[PDB]
Design a protein around this nucleic acid. Structure first.
Lengths: 208, 209, 208, 209
DNA sequence: CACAATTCTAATTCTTCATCGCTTGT
DNA sequence: ACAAGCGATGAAGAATTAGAATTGTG
């Protein structure tokens, strides 16, 4: 019961308030205010909420080439009026729509219904299927726990990315110190040929 | 090719919208009552429902239909109340419309939900039949309750797909009680011997084969 | 030990969805749109939410006589952001203020903060404290269940009120048929001398 | 008679605000560091706290301060994001205010929080010492783990009252996982035989005394 | 009265935390 | 070599599935 999430919005306290309810909801969040920054986080993202009027042009015009990267449930949430925009937003690749002042439970409903190969995460000699929660290393499946599988998968999708151990507490356990090492050592000592290059202070990324 | 379906008792606008939809390329199906929905649900690849039909409300019968063919169910009604948009979409509904609608708004929500036998299952061990609502494990006709008959069917459709106990009370029961499922499988190990249901610590339950 | 709630807002959509994620939350709600309609819904409540934009005048000018009845946590929220209005809203009896745009979680945080003699609701030969959930009837103490005690004190606060059998179901059972009859019998058969006057195939009511 | 307190390292702004309260008449205290924030917590009927402090954060140590006296508190900080606002309010706060503010705004929020031996307790058969974390239950000396002492602590504080297991996790354990309390009382019947703990099937637990 | 959800309850599978010692660069 | 930091060690305290009569109920 855990997936990923993305956000795009320039509004300040409304993009802030929404991302509090979702981190209280249990879906990890990425927040962006520049189309120049949406290319990095797209592959990481399984879902996208968007706004229409923004810097670097109208976002819907920059949309379809990101759809071309991944078939991702994309919802344009924005203040605008015409049904012409509804056709403008949904003739292209898109899978719903909303509008202006709204209630936050409305958005939570339209995205909950959309939640219900691409399901794999392949890196180097490793197949991770979360529909079964099984890992394979050179044709060998080793069973892990819900927390061991969590940290490994977050770094099975994030390649070459380093985050801090305090950040790993709030990214593997969800919203609310030395376990990070004694269990990544549970991983090294139980997965022969583990390719996690330890670092100093700041610590963990996956080369490939 | 492409097929669809619709359910509407109001005559003038329904007849006219399927005309423009028959003018459109799609081949069209239509009924006026809920007893006629289950006949052609299968051959249809997309449906259009309403909340105010003659023979009752369409949501109470919905989730059984998505478990014969999971096709995009687009609700359409005069109920602009947001609590319907909640009960609808948190039942097996994808999207809504407004009671009057722009025609190109409707189609745009048809393509957007199109671009992105069925009664018999074949578990290597045994056989399940949803018509007679029974089970045959190596010849034995096991006696189950509806609760324990229903949780096995949603799992036999997605075997090997482990899911948490919180995402099953929203899938066997109605969406939106208590903490129970641990005892509902314990009875199925008690009466179906050697049934491959692996239990994971802190994760969930799943069927391997 | 769940409790009550109340709402005063003429704006319909933002009062529509606001009560959704509260019914999703687990507190029953009351929906008002006139100050002449605010008077009757007060005593039954531990909490009160209020708007300053109302038909039939300024809501703060009808405020202290509601404080007289019960000292209730009554937040305010409006398009009036002036600290002068904050002094107006808070010199008089209240506990908080807010702003038109928010996270729905801000209210949720600012209502969980207020929850923590008046615990009782007392009727004919009946003493019901919700903090212990024992019934005292003519002096006798008698056991109940989770739902038995919940519907008994439901009709204990509501004097002479009548809800339909379907209305009693969604109220005492989780959101989103014959038991209402058989359980009110497990109420009569438990305690004799209970003024549940059955009506015409319709509803039920506790008179006094 | 009416007392209150303040916590801030900022020098002149704190000086001008406590003088206004002394101009307001409310007898007040002030501490500049967390080193002495704990001593004078008892004498105050209200506390104004700032998280921006040189010797660390304040919310990370908030709940044990309220756990000694349930007096309302207010947070004042340069962190005006809603994620900081809800985090403080959910971790035991009682109100909130922005960083740059007017005076009567504070005052009106001082009265609004005013108009509506705390270390040892003695109950039947239990004579509890919270400082040394020891209990003498029926003549014997009992010593168990920490969480099993904070659990019999908030119950020993609000005893005779029931609380659902959901309302204990955010009240005894760290908020800002269900099969636990069902087992945490079990060993309380193993180590404290004869404890006066009734249970409510479907509801929470309580101490009968 | 049948059916179902509760509390035990009993025996494990996992986090977290000190301690030595060990891996990086300073 | 020194000086922070990072393997490892292996526990002990949390969770985590399994039975039995009880309780509640649509």
């Amino acid at each position: 019961m855990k997936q990923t999430l993305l956000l795009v919005e320039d509004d300040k306290n409304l993009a802030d308030g929404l991302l509090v309810s979702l981190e209280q909801a249990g879906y990890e969040c990425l927040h962006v205010e520049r189309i120049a920054d949406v290319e990095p986080q797209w592959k990481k993202a399984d879902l996208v909420i968007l706004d229409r009027q923004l810097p670097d042009g109208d976002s819907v015009q920059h949309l379809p080439e990101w759809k071309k990267i991944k078939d991702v449930p994309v919802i344009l949430l924005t203040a605008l009026v015409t049904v012409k925009d509804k056709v403008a937003g949904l003739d292209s690749g898109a899978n719903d729509y909303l509008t202006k002042p709204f209630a936050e439970a409305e958005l939570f409903a339209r995205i909950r219904a959309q939640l219900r190969n691409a399901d794999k995460v392949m890196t180097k000699d490793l197949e991770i299927d979360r529909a079964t929660r099984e890992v394979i290393f050179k044709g060998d499946l080793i069973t892990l726990t819900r927390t061991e599988f969590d940290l490994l998968l977050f770094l099975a999708s994030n390649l070459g990315r380093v985050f801090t151990r305090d950040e790993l507490l709030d990214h593997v356990w969800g919203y609310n110190t030395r376990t990070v090492d004694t269990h990544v050592l549970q991983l090294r000592q139980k997965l022969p040929g583990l390719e996690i290059e330890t670092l100093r202070g700041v610590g963990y990324k996956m080369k490939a």
